[PDB]
Write a protein that binds this ligand. Structure first.
Ligand SMILES: [Zn+2]
Length: 430
C-alpha cells in the first residue's frame, strides 16, 4: 500500500503544507476506549533504528531515519546488491531534487548496511518491510524478541497480513505496531501509525515521537486507509480528466491552476510520474470503461515518464518535462457540458468540491472517522473546508455551505454522475 505515489495527488507545496499542518490535531492521539492516550503515555527515546528488508520501502524508510542523524541499520539479504540499489535510488532522487549530495553525506554517516542480526541488540525501534509471508514475519519478530532489549518497539509495514496474527506470536504482543510510510518518502510527510488490538500506549507514543524526530507527521488509525485514498484519488482525477475532454483544457493549464492553488504538483504531472499504465491495468482487471482521452493515450502507450511521453513529453538526457503538441491534438479533437466552467476558481471547484464530498461519503460509510480524515488532509497539505475550530478557508470559500450548494446545482445539470450527489454527512457537518 502507498508505494506507487497515490498520495502525490494531494500533497501540498511547502507553503500550503506549512499553513495546513497547523490545523491537524493528530498529535493529540488516543487509543480506543480506555487503552491510553498522548496525555498518559511514556515514549522511549529512539536513538537507534533498524529497518529489515532492502526493497523500495525498506530503503526509503532507512533514508528518512538516516537523514535525521539517527543510527540506522538496514538489514538485508544481499548487502552488495543493497548498496547498488541505494545508489540508483540516490541518483533518481537527486534528479527530482528530493535529495542532494550534502544530505546523502548525512544519510551515509548514519546508515549501516548489514545482514547480521546480532548488531541490533541496542536498537530502540525495528521496522520490518519484508515480503508478505505470514510465517516469515512471525518467525522474524519471534526471533527479534529474544535478541532485542525489552523496550524495543516492533513496527511492521505489512499491507496484506493481519497485524494481530503477527503479534499473536510474541510473548509480549503489545510492542507491535503498524507503520506505513508513503511513496515518495522524501516528499510525503504523512505516516500511518496503525494500532492492533493489543498495541500498547508506549508503543504508540514511541512511534509518534520517532516519526516527529524525523520530520514526519504521524496519524493514529485503526486500519490502513489506502481504500480511502484510492477513492478520493479516483474522484479527483476523473474530474481532472473531464476538464480535458469536455472542456478544452490542456494538461499544463490544469496543473498550473492546481499548483497556483498550492498543491505541489498537478494531476497530469503526477499521473506521468506514477505511470499512467497503472490506471489502464486497473480497468484491465474490471473492464472498463475508458474515457476518450484514456482510450487514445493507452493505445499510443503514452504512460508518462517510463515511456518518455504521457500527458507531457520527456526528452532523453536529464529527462526534462516539456509540453507535447500531439497531446493537444487528442484534446482539441474531443461543444458540450451543461455545467459552467468560465475561470480558474470554477476549475478548482470542479476538481476539489466533489473530492471533499467523497471524503464525507467515506466518513458516513464507516471507512474512516471524521477526525482521522480531516487530520490526514491537513497533514497532506490538501486542507479542509472545516476544522475543529469551525469553518476553514478552502480556496475562495470557507465551510461547507457554498460547496453543498454548488454540488446540488451540478447534480441538477448532470443527475447521472454520482460525484455530484451530496452526502448526508456533508449536509450534516454543514
Ligand atoms: Zn496504509
Amino acid at each position: 500500500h502507498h508505494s506507487t505515489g497515490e498520495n502525490l495527488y494531494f500533497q501540498g507545496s511547502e507553503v500550503r503544507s506549512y499553513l495546513m499542518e497547523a490545523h491537524s490535531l493528530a498529535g493529540q492521539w488516543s487509543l480506543p476506549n480506555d487503552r491510553g492516550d498522548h496525555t498518559n503515555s511514556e515514549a522511549y527515546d529512539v536513538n537507534s533504528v533498524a529497518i529489515i528488508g532492502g526493497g523500495t520501502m525498506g530503503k526509503a524508510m532507512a533514508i528518512c531515519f538516516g537523514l535525521a542523524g539517527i543510527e540506522t541499520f538496514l538489514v538485508v539479504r544481499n548487502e552488495q546488491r543493497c548498496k547498488q540499489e541505494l545508489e540508483v535510488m540516490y541518483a533518481r532522487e537527486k534528479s527530482f531534487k528530493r535529495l542532494n549530495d550534502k544530505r546523502i553525506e548525512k544519510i551515509n554517516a548514519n546508515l549501516k548496511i548489514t545482514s547480521d542480526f546480532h548488531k541490533l541488540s541496542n536498537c530502540d525501534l525495528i521496522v520490518e518491510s519484508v515480503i508478505e509471508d505470514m510465517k516469515l514475519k512471525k518467525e522474524l519478530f519471534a526471533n527479534l524478541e529474544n535478541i532485542c532489549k525489552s523496550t524495543c518497539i516492533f513496527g511492521t509495514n505489512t499491507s496484506s497480513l493481519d497485524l494481530n496474527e503477527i503479534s499473536s506470536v510474541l510473548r509480549d504482543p503489545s510492542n507491535l505496531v503498524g507503520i506505513h510510510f508513503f511513496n515518495p518518502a522524501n516528499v510525503i510527510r504523512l505516516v500511518e501509525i496503525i494500532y492492533g488490538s493489543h498495541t500498547s500506549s508506549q508503543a504508540i507514543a514511541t512511534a509518534f515521537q520517532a516519526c516527529e524526530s524525523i520530520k514526519k507527521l504521524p496519524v493514529l488509525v485503526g486500519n490502513c486507509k489506502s481504500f480511502v485514498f484510492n477513492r478520493l484519488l479516483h474522484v479527483y482525477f476523473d474530474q481532472s480528466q473531464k476538464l480535458m475532454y469536455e472542456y478544452g483544457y490542456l494538461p499544463h493549464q490544469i496543473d498550473k491552476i492546481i499548483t497556483n492553488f498550492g498543491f505541489l504538483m498537478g494531476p497530469m504531472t503526477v499521473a506521468d510520474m506514477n505511470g499512467f499504465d497503472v490506471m489502464e491495468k486497473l480497468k484491465k482487471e474490471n473492464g472498463l470503461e475508458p474515457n476518450p482521452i484514456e482510450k487514445e493515450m493507452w493505445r499510443l502507450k503514452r504512460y508518462g515518464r517510463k515511456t518518455n511521453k504521457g500527458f507531457y513529453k520527456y526528452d532523453d538526457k536529464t529527462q526534462r518535462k516539456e509540453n507535447d503538441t500531439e497531446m493537444e491534438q487528442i484534446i482539441r479533437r474531443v461543444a458540450k457540458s451543461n455545467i459552467q466552467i468560465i475561470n480558474d476558481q470554477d476549475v478548482i471547484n470542479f476538481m476539489l468540491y466533489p473530492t471533499v464530498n467523497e471524503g464525507y461519503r467515506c466518513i458516513e460509510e464507516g471507512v474512516i472517522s471524521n477526525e482521522s480524515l480531516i487530520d490526514i488532509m491537513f497533514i497532506l497539505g490538501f486542507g479542509w473546508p472545516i476544522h475543529s475550530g469551525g469553518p476553514m478557508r478552502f480556496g475562495k470559500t470557507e465551510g461547507l455551505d457554498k460547496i453543498a450548494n454548488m454540488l446540488v446545482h451540478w447534480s441538477s445539470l448532470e443527475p447521472k454522475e454520482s460525484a455530484y450527489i451530496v452526502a448526508d454527512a456533508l449536509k450534516t457537518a454543514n
